[PDB]
């Protein structure tokens, strides 16, 4: 009932050595890196909801020991833990797939393989035998290896509550478990604990606007997608798009400040801007200096949105008369290059000399803008690896990183007048450091939990690979925040679909 | 001979449990961690090259298994490498030191541990064995421990060619030890190995000079010394002193703008510097904002060294009129604060309202100051702890990371022309982030290089846990610099005292 | 499974005396001072719901014991009592940390240490051995020990009734337990009972106003706080404040 | 095994053979046919083809001076005769010849990569793997018995294979000279390498 399919000991007669194991590690169960997942009425039939490959990586010791070794032999036993209630009607079915071969679709299929089949009420613990089915004396690390495979036999009818499942796995190595070939311990495999450091987000940088401290985390309903191309970063590509690790430093950028005008009721003046990452305006380049700004200022606006820019023209040594000026980008009639990334912009100096180098930095916003309106960056169009839009999963909203912009305004003929605004962020590279030091387990996101008073109150959000982090709400608002007091602490390893126990309610 | 003191086995009866070993880890022998020193004509007798705890961190597969348990017992044997010459004259002798028990500063005092010499001549290896002393049944983490100690039994004499010795140890640990205890893989100890990201140096920030990319490595023989206080993180308390996680947010202060002039040319006024984080000017605190400014723009000069800011006068919202004005720390006539931290300023705004707030930007620096006046920093005495100076060992120069400032000046009457001028900064908190995860071993330096062309050449640096790199010259140079092609990479851990093989010619 | 860790016997060849302990004493479970709390869909996640130092202070009749003598060594086994129902959806964690080993703030790392698993549901009580980890002969009072920690290791989600949960815990020495050393008994530590007079609180003096006998008892949810430096008495510091044990 | 002989009358001159890893023997049960190879290529030691490498004082510190894939094309004769078989199984024999000076300061070190492990690049990491150390002023020469890495009966063609690594120690400091120290390997099948499943030689 337990050992369906029967385990075949190796002979190891190839290896030339075989390293024995503590042997109080077989005796001793732990959960299984990202082995977690849960199920509701609302899961489609059908649909695979965990597929963990039978390796090492099952155990928490195992894996720390795998990294002395080339080579392993063996096979584990799995116990499934059900967090069910009297009320909880289904059947789960759990199989195990001999390498090259197709998972099948439907549970009636499944009932094939070597499987076990357990109810959402059960209390105890299923226990399941997970073979090491090879074609080889021992495995090398990157081979094809067997798969266990959890799907819903049954569906959840009762819909009595109607509320979430959460299950989880144990692991340990079977009694023949074998390593070999003593190797120094460094690996570039994902570490199965990343303990983070503790530092409060207000300690960290803002990408779209250095200068100003991060002063709070933001969520808002309103905002179902980001397409930002500053704070983008990825676990597995890092930077992303325009983004940068230092956006304080590759914040100003410079424009040769080309003659040609464009009609409104002050004088407008075109300029390009520099690429010294890209001196030849190729297409398959970025078209803007490497994390310059995506303010956004809006869709069609020349007498209402502008965007404020301390200026100053080029000069041996450095730069001489350095001012505000209000800018935007390219041309607002023309569509396709209103609003979009590009080097033709808009200068507020009717004394700009032709082709004459010019300082520029992103500083503020004036006019009739809003916080709205900075949040939408403009297009990007070409074919330059621009960083895709993103939105949250159903049930699930963005947390911001969110700053204050101080107003700039003059009581003489300076020329501007800023409003105060805020700035909204994606991610912050300071985060996102720790992450690349200890990778991320392949198709799992990490589940973060966030301290404020002490231990008081926690809340807990999703970190996706993608560079986002996301929570679960009930109610609707546009203006909730958080502190920024911090301590942010790891949790474990779930998968993509895993509901968040924790409910953060915008209605209070 | 080769066991100087035979070791006492320890029955091990009081443990929960015995956690054997893989027996192959004891067959093999690998180099000692940070168990690597050399030794020149210029070491002086009676000096420490190496100490060490006997613990399980004395070899590789040992220290990366012992974060899976809580307890070990057992001793090491210790093989010694010599690479010696013919010409060479002198011995070495150490001895185990039992815990308390204190080492002579002598070799006379050391013959009487169980010890053992050879010549430096040998081309073999000479075994010792390092007992684990203890009154107790096993060790638990946190007690004392004994240590190795290694003296001259001879200073060198040859210098017929006069060149240096490198030593390294090798270990392996005797047949009784043991573990005990299996714990989660997550332990203080310090990781064997430290693989750290491959982010170049321009890819990371300024600390004492946001907005300005890292545009190069400087080492100049001529800052024999550090006094800064911005730019200072540390393994063990992480920032020190005025340091601060995110520059570029902290960049900016406020000031009081209190009434008040002194004599000049043009007219000056005094101004406090707000203290968010110190709201009482009490002594035991920094007297400045957190991370806000340390130029040091001279000792003694009221008309030709000043610092340039950007002012604004404080309103609803922001500010206004935010023009660049010069400044400078304390008062210039009076001695003890001309140059020091504390909350009196000057400012060059003769219509300089009473007590209204004014925003600060450091930003460009004016006048004869130059890149040597921008190493000087503006002192600091006080109960608030300020970093204590900091210098690379003699015959070793400190490596920083150098940026362009860029001028700014004007033609119209703005106010202030500044001058060219390049900042210099200690560490990097990008460089010191990944070392926080893995710590470093108790009273050991980490051994760096430094890839520059693909692979074709090599610049290593050894970075102290206090907080700064150093790098081995013979030349004398004002204005060497290294490229930023980036790519640091982890090589080992030395003692303190190891001098760095690869040298650095500043004549070319 | 019930004894994921082997108990260790000491010889006690250090000890000048063994002093035996009245047999009937391993055979009888009795509550553990202290050794209640309650859980609820409100608790935070990896909190901590209890700690206890594995010592003789787990079980009425040892504590009582315990105060004539000098030293001790064995391990206890332990017995958790749920207070659940057919709605609750979770389950709990306990788990034994070695001395010197600091407590993670994740129910996902203590599966790591010798640990148990029950649901919220079961009716039973769950067994767990708690052995005595010492790196020394026998134990002095003062000296670090063992710990058990309870946390939540799947959150409550059904959230249907919504009621607290109450947890209890019952324990027993093991049959390996001794004492040592005979002394007269007299010590600083608290009692496990705290038997209170029968004194009604009008029978109490005011400290805020002596000449007037204490009338009721008073609740009001307007009086959020209390900044009084007259009638503040603590338990480790005796009187606090400007407060006096003769207010009149 | 370790032999040593006086040089002329001043110093000594070290030939070991070392067996770092446990070479073990295939039964080859699963071949359809063992082809033995003529007894005299055993016999001869020939230059290790891109076995020819340098090092320097200004070399990358830690940086691998080899890599050698433990397999038919170390040896002239065995890599002549692969092309006429399909598959094959057995170690090596590797002999090191190095190019010092009397100023070259240090010392060498060897070691066996198994496959698909990633190389490092410092000498302290090197020590973790089965290893070797020499000096560098010798005439003498060194022997290793690369043992053949497999999980398999028999390799086919464009398995993954072991290496061998040769590195610097403890890195020059003398530099009187300053030349470069190129480096050279002999290599011959072991007793027990065959082939197998004779194929037209294209």
């Known amino acids: 009932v337990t050992a369906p399919l029967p385990e075949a000991v190796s002979s190891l007669s190839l290896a030339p050595t075989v390293n024995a194991l503590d042997p109080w590690v077989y005796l001793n169960q732990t959960e299984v890196p990202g082995g977690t997942f849960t199920v509701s009425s609302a899961t489609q039939p059908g649909s695979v909801l965990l597929e963990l490959e039978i390796s090492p990586e099952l155990n928490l010791y195992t894996s720390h020991l795998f990294r002395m070794y080339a080579g392993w032999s063996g096979g584990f036993s799995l116990k499934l833990l059900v967090a069910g209630n009297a009320f909880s ?34 209390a105890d613990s299923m226990e399941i035998i997970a073979p090491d089915i090879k074609n080889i004396d021992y495995h090398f690390r990157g081979d094809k290896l067997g798969k266990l495979v959890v799907m819903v036999y049954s569906p959840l009818r009762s819909t009595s509550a109607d509320f979430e499942i959460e299950i989880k796995l144990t692991s340990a190595p079977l009694p023949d478990f074998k390593f070999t070939m003593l190797v120094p311990p460094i690996q570039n495999n994902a570490l199965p604990i990343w303990s983070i450091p503790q530092a409060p987000p207000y300690s960290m940088v803002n990408p779209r606007s250095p200068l100003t401290p991060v002063v709070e985390l933001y969520i808002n309903s309103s905002y179902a997608t980001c397409n930002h191309q500053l704070g983008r970063y990825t676990i597995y590509q890092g930077a992303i798009g325009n983004s940068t690790f230092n956006p304080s430093g590759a914040w100003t950028a410079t424009c040769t400040a080309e003659a040609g005008s464009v009609t409104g009721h002050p004088n407008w003046r075109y300029a390009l801007l520099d690429l010294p990452d890209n001196p030849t305006f190729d297409p398959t380049l970025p078209p803007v200096p490497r994390g310059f700004c995506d303010w956004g200022s809006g869709v069609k606006s020349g007498n209402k949105q502008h965007l404020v820019c301390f200026t100053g023209k080029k000069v041996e040594g450095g730069f001489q008369d350095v001012d505000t000026h209000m800018w935007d980008y390219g041309d607002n009639e023309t569509v396709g290059l209103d609003n979009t990334y590009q080097r033709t912009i808009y200068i507020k100096d009717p004394s700009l000399e032709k082709d004459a180098q010019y300082l520029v930095i992103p500083m503020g916003v004036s006019g009739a803008a809003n916080d709205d309106t900075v949040q939408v960056a403009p297009n990007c169009y070409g074919s330059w690896d621009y960083a895709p839009t993103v939105a949250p999963p159903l049930g699930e909203q963005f947390v911001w990183f969110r700053s204050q912009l101080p107003a700039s305004k003059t009581t003489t003929t300076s020329g501007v007048n800023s409003v105060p605004v805020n700035v909204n962020a994606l991610m912050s590279p300071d985060l996102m450091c720790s992450a690349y030091a200890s990778g991320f ?34 109610g609707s608002n546009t203006g909730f925040i958080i502190p920024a007091d911090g301590y942010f602490r790891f949790n474990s390893w779930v998968s993509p679909s895993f509901m968040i126990s924790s409910v953060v309610d915008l209605n209070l």
Not at 90 to 118: D, Q, R
Not at 445 to 473: C, H, I, W
Request: glycine share 8%.
């Open 89 to 122: 009607a289904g059947k789960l079915i759990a199989a195990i797939i001999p390498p090259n071969i197709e998972v099948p679709n439907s549970a009636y299929l499944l009932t094939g393989f070597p499987h076990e089949i357990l109810d959402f009420r059960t």
């Open 441 to 474: 387990p392949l198709g799992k996101v990490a589940l973060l939990d966030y301290v404020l008073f002490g231990g008081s109150v926690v809340r807990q959000f999703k970190l996706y690979p993608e560079g986002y982090m996301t929570a679960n709400t009930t």
